[PDB]
Tab-separated table of C-alpha atoms and ligand atoms in Angstrom:
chain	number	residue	atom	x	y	z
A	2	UNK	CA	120.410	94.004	108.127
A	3	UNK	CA	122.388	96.656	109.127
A	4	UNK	CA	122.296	100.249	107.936
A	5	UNK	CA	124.581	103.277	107.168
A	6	UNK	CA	126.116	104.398	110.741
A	7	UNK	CA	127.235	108.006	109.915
A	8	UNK	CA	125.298	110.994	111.115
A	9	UNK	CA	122.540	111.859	108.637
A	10	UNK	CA	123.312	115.523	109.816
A	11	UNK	CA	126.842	115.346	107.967
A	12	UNK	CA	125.499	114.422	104.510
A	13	UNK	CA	121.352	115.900	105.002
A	14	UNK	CA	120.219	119.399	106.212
A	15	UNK	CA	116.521	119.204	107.616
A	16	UNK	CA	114.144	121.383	107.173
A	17	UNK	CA	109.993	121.565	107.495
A	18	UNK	CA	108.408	118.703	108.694
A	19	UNK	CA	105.601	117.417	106.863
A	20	UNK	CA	104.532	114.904	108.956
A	21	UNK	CA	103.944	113.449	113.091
A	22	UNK	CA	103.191	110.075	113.853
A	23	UNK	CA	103.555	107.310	117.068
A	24	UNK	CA	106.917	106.462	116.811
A	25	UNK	CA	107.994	108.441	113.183
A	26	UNK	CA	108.304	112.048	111.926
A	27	UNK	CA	108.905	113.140	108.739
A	28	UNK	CA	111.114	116.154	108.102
A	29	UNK	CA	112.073	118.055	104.361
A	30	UNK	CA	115.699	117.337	104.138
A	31	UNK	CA	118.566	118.302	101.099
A	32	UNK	CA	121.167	116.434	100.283
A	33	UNK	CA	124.795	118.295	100.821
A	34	UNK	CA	126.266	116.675	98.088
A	35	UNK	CA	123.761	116.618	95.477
A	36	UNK	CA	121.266	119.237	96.233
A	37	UNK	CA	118.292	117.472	96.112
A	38	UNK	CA	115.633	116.829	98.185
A	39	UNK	CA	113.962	114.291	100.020
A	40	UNK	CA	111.962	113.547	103.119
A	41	UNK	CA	113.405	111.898	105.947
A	42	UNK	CA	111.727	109.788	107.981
A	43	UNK	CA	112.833	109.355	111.702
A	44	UNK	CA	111.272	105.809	113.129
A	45	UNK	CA	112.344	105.693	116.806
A	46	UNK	CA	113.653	102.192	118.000
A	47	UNK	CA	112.760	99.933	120.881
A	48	UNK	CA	115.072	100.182	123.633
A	49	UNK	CA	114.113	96.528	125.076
A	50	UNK	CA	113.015	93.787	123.432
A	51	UNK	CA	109.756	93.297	125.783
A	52	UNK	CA	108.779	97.110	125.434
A	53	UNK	CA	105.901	98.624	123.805
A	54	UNK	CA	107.660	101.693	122.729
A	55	UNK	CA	109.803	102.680	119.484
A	56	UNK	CA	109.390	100.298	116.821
A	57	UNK	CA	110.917	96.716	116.912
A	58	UNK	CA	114.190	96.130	114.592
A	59	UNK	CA	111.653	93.527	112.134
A	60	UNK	CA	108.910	95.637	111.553
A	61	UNK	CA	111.604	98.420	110.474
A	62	UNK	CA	113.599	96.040	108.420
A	63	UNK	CA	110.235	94.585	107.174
A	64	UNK	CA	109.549	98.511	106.054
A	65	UNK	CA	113.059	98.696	104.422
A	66	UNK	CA	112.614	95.502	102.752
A	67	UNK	CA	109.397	96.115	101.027
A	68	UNK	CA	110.654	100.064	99.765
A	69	UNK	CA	113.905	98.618	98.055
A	70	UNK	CA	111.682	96.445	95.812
A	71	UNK	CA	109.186	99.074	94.521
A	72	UNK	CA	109.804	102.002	91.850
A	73	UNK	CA	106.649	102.844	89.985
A	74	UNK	CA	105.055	106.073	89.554
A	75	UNK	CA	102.639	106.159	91.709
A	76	UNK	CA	104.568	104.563	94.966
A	77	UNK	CA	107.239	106.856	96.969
A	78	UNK	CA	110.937	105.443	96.365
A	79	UNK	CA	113.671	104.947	98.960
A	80	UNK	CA	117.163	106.980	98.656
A	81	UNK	CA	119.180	105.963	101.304
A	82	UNK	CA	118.538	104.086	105.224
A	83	UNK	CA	120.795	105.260	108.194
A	84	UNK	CA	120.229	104.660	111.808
A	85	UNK	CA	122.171	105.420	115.290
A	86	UNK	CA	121.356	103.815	118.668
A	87	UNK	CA	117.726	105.707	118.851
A	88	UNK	CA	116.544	105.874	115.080
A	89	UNK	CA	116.384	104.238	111.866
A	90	UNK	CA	116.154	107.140	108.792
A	91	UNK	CA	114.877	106.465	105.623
A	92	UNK	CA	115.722	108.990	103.226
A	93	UNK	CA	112.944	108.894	100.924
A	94	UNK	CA	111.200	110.060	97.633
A	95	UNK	CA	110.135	113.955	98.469
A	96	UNK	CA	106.335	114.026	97.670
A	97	UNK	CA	105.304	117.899	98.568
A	98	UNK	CA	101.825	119.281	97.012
A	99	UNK	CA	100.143	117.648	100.810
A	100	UNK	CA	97.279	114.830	101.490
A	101	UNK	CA	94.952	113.675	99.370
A	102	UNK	CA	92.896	114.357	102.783
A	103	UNK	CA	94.030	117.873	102.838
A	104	UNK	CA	93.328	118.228	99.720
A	105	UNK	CA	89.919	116.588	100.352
A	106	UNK	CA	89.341	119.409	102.494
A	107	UNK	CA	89.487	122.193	100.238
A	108	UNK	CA	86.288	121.199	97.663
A	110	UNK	CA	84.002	116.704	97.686
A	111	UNK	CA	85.041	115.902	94.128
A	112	UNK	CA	82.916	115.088	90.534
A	113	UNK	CA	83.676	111.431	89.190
A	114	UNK	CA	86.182	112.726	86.940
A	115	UNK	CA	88.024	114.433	89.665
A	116	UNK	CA	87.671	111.074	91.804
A	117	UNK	CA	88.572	108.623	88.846
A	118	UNK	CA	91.559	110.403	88.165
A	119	UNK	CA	92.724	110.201	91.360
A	120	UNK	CA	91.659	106.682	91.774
A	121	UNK	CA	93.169	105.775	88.572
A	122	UNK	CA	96.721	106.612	90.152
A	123	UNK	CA	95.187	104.661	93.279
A	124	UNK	CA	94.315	101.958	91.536
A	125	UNK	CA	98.026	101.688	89.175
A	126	UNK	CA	100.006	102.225	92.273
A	127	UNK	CA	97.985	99.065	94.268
A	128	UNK	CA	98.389	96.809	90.972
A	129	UNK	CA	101.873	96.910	90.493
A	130	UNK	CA	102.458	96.007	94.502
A	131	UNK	CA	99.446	93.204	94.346
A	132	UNK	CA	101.614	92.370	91.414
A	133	UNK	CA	104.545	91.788	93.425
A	134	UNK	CA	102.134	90.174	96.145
A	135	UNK	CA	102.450	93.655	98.000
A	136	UNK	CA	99.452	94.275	100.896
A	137	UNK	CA	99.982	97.930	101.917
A	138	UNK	CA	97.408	97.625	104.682
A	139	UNK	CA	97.432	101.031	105.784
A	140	UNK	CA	95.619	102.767	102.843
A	141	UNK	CA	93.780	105.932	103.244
A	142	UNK	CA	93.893	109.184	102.324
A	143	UNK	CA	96.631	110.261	104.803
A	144	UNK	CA	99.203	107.937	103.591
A	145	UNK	CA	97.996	109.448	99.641
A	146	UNK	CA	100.113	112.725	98.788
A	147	UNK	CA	100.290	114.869	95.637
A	148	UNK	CA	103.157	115.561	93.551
A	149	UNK	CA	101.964	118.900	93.133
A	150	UNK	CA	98.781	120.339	94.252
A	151	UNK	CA	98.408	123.106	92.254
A	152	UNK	CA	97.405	121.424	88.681
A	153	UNK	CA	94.006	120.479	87.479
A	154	UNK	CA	94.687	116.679	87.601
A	155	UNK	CA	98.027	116.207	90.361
A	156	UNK	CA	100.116	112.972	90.469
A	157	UNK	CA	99.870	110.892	93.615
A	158	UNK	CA	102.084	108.729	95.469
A	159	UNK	CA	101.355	105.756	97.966
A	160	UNK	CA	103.465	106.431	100.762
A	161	UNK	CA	104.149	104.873	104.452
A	162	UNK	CA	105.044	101.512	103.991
A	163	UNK	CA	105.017	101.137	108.122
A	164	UNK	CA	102.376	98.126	107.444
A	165	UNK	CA	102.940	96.478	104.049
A	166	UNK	CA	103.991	92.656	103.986
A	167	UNK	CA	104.935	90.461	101.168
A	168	UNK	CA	101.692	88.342	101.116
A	169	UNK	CA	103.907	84.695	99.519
A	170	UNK	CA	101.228	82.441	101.029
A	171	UNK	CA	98.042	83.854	100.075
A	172	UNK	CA	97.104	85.192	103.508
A	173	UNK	CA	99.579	86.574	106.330
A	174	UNK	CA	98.122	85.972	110.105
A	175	UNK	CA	99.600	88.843	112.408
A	176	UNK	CA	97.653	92.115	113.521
A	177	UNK	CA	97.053	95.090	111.451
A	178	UNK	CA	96.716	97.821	113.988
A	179	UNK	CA	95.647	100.391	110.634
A	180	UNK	CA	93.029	103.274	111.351
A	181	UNK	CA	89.532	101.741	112.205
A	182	UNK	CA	87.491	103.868	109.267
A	183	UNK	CA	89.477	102.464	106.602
A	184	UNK	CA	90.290	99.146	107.798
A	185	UNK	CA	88.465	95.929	106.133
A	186	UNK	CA	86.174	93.236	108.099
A	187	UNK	CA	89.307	90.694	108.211
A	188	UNK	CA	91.517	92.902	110.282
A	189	UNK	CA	88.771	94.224	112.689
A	190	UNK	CA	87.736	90.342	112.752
A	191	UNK	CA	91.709	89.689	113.160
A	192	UNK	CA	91.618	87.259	110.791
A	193	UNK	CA	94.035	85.737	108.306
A	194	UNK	CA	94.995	88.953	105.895
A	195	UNK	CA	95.619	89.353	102.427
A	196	UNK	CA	96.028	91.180	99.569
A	197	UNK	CA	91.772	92.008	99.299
A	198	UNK	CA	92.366	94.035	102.739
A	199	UNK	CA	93.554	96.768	100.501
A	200	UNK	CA	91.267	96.734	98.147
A	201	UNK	CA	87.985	97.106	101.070
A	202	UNK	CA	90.445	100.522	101.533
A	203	UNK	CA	90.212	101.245	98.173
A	204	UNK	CA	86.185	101.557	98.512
A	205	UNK	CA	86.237	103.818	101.924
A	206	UNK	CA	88.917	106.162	99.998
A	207	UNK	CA	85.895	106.284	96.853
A	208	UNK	CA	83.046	106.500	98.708
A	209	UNK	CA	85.087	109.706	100.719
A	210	UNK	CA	86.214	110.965	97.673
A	211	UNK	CA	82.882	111.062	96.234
A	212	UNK	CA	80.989	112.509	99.007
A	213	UNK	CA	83.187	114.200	101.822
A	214	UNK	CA	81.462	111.276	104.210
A	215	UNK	CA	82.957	107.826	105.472
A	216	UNK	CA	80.488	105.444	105.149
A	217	UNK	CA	81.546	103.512	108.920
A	218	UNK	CA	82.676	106.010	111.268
A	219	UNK	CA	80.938	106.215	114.187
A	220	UNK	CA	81.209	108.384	116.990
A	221	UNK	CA	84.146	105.791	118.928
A	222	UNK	CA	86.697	103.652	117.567
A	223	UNK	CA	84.475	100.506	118.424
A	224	UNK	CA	80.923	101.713	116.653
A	225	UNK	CA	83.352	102.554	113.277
A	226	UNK	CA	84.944	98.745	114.099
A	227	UNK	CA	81.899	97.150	114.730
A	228	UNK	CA	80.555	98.984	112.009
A	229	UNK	CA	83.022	97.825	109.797
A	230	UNK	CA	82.627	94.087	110.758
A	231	UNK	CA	78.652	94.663	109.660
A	232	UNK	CA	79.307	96.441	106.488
A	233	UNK	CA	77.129	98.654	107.985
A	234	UNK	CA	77.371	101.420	105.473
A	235	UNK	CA	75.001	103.082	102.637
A	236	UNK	CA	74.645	105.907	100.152
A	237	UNK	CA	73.129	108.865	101.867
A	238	UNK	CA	71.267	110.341	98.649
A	239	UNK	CA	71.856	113.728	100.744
A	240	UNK	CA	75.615	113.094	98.859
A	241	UNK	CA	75.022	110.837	96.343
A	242	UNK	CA	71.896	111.909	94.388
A	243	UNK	CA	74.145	112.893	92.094
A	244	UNK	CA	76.513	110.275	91.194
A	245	UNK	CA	76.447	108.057	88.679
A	246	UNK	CA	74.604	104.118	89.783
A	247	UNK	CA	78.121	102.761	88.003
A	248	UNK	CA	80.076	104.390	90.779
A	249	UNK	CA	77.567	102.815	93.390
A	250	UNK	CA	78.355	99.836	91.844
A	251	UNK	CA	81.824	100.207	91.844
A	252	UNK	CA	81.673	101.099	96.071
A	253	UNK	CA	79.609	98.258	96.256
A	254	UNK	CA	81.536	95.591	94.769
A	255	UNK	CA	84.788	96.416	97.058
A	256	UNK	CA	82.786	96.882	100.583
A	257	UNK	CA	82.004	93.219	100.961
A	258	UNK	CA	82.654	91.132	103.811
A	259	UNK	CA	83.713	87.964	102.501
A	260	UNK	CA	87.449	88.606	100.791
A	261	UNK	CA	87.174	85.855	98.233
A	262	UNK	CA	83.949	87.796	96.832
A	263	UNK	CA	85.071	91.093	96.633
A	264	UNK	CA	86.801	93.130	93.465
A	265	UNK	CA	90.528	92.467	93.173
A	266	UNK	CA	92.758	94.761	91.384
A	267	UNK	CA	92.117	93.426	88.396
A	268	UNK	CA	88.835	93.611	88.299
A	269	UNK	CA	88.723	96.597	89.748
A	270	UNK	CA	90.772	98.126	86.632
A	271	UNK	CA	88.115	96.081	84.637
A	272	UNK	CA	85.496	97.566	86.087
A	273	UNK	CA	82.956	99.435	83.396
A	274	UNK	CA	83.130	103.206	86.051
A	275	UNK	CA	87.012	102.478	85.478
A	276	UNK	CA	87.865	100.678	82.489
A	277	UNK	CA	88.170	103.050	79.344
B	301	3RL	C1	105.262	110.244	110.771
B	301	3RL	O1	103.834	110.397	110.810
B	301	3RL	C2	103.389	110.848	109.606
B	301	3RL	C3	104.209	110.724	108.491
B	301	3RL	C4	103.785	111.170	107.253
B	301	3RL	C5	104.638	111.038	106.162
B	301	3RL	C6	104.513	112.167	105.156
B	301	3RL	C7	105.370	112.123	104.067
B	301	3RL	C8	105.443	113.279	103.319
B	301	3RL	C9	106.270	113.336	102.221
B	301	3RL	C10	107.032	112.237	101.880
B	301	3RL	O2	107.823	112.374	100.798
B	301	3RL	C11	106.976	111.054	102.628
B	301	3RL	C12	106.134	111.001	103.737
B	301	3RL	C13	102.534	111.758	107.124
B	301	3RL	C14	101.701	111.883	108.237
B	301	3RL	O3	100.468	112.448	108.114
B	301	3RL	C15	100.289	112.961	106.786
B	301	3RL	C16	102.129	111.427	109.481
C-alpha cells in the first residue's frame, strides 16, 4: 500500500517533539490548511531488505493497517500517512497533557486515582480485543493524557508499532516489547495472543498502585527471567494500604498460563472494577 508522496513540510509545520524512539520520533505539527494539530510520527525505513535498520515496509503497513480501523475514545486516531524514500509519517491524533509514566512521577496513586485511570485502560483494550486487536506494547509510556491538569484526565492508547490482528487465536512471531511489562508467552517466545495484553494490564496496576514494578530486576534478563517465574509479590512496605480486592485483581492477571488468566471481560467484571 502506497502512501501520499508530497512533502509533509508543504501541508504540516513541525514543532516540539514529544517523543524519541529506535527508528521513530514524534514531533507537534499544525496543519496549514486547517489549523489544527496533530503529532507526526517519523518511522525511518529500511534501506535493504536484509538490514537490521529502519523499519521494514510490513511492519509499517501492519501499523497503518491496524490505526485506520480504530476510533474510540480512549485509542489515538490516524489523520493522514505520507512517506518519501527515508520515512513513512503518520499524522496522528495530538494527545498533549504527557505519560501516564510522567505523570506517575509526580505523586503513587489511591485506588480511585488508579481505577479511573484503569477504567480508560481497560475501555480502550476492550474495544481492540473486540476487534481481535493485541497491542503488545502496553505500558505506561505508550499511555498519554488528554490533559494533565484535571482531577480525573482522559487517556489515550497510543503506538501501535506492535499491535496485530490476532484472526487465529494466537499469532507466532516475536514481540521485542520492554522486558518489565512483557507477559511469560513473549519472554517464553511462544505463540501470542490477545491475554499478552492483559499480563500488561497487571504490571501497569500493580505500578500504578505502588510506584514499584513487581519484576524488574537489576538487567534485562533477571526482569525476563523474572517474568517467566511470575516472580513477583506485594511488598506490604507499598501495599499495606490497599484494598485485598485490588490484590486480587493484580493477582488474577499475573498468571503464567494465558488460558487461566482474566480477559477483558472479566476483567471489566471484576468486583475492584465492576460498578
Ligand atoms: C518515537 O518514540 C517515542 C514516541 C512516542 C510517541 C508520543 C506521542 C505523543 C503524542 C501523540 O499524539 C502520539 C505519540 C513517545 C515516546 O515516549 C513517550 C517515544
Amino acid at each position: 500500500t502506497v502512501f501520499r508522496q508530497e512533502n509533509v513540510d508543504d501541508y504540516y509545520d513541525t514543532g516540539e517533539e514529544l517523543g524519541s524512539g529506535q527508528f521513530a520520533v514524534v514531533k507537534k505539527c499544525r496543519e496549514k490548511s486547517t489549523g489544527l494539530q496533530y503529532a507526526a510520527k517519523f518511522i525511518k525505513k529500511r534501506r535493504t531488505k536484509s538490514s537490521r535498520r529502519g523499519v521494514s515496509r510490513e511492519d509499517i503497513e501492519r501499523e497503518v493497517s491496524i490505526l485506520k480501523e480504530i476510533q474510540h475514545p480512549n485509542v489515538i486516531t490516524l489523520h493522514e500517512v505520507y512517506e518519501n524514500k527515508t520515512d513513512v509519517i503518520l499524522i496522528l491524533e495530538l494527545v498533549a497533557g504527557g505519560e501516564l509514566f510522567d505523570f506517575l512521577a509526580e505523586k503513587s496513586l489511591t485506588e480511585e486515582e488508579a481505577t479511573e485511570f484503569l477504567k480508560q485502560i481497560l475501555n480502550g483494550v476492550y474495544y481492540l480485543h473486540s476487534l481481535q486487536i493485541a497491542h503488545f506494547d502496553l505500558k505506561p509510556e505508550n499511555i498519554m493524557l488528554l490533559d494533565r491538569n484535571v482531577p480525573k484526565p482522559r487517556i489515550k492508547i497510543i503506538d501501535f508499532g506492535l499491535a496485530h490482528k490476532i484472526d487465529f487465536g494466537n499469532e507466532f512471531k516475536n514481540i521485542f516489547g520492554t522486558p518489565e511489562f512483557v507477559a511469560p508467552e513473549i519472554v517464553n517466545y511462544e505463540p501470542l495472543g490477545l491475554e499478552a495484553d492483559m499480563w500488561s494490564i497487571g504490571v501497569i496496576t500493580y505500578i500504578l498502585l505502588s510506584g514499584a514494578s513487581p519484576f524488574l530486576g537489576d538487567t534485562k534478563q533477571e526482569t525476563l527471567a523474572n517474568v517467566s517465574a511470575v516472580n513477583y509479590e506485594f511488598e506490604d512496605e507499598y501495599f499495606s494500604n490497599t484494598s485485598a480486592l485490588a490484590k486480587d485483581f493484580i493477582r488474577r492477571l499475573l498468571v503464567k498460563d494465558p488460558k487461566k488468566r482474566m480477559t477483558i471481560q472479566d476483567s471489566l467484571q471484576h468486583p475492584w472494577i465492576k460498578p
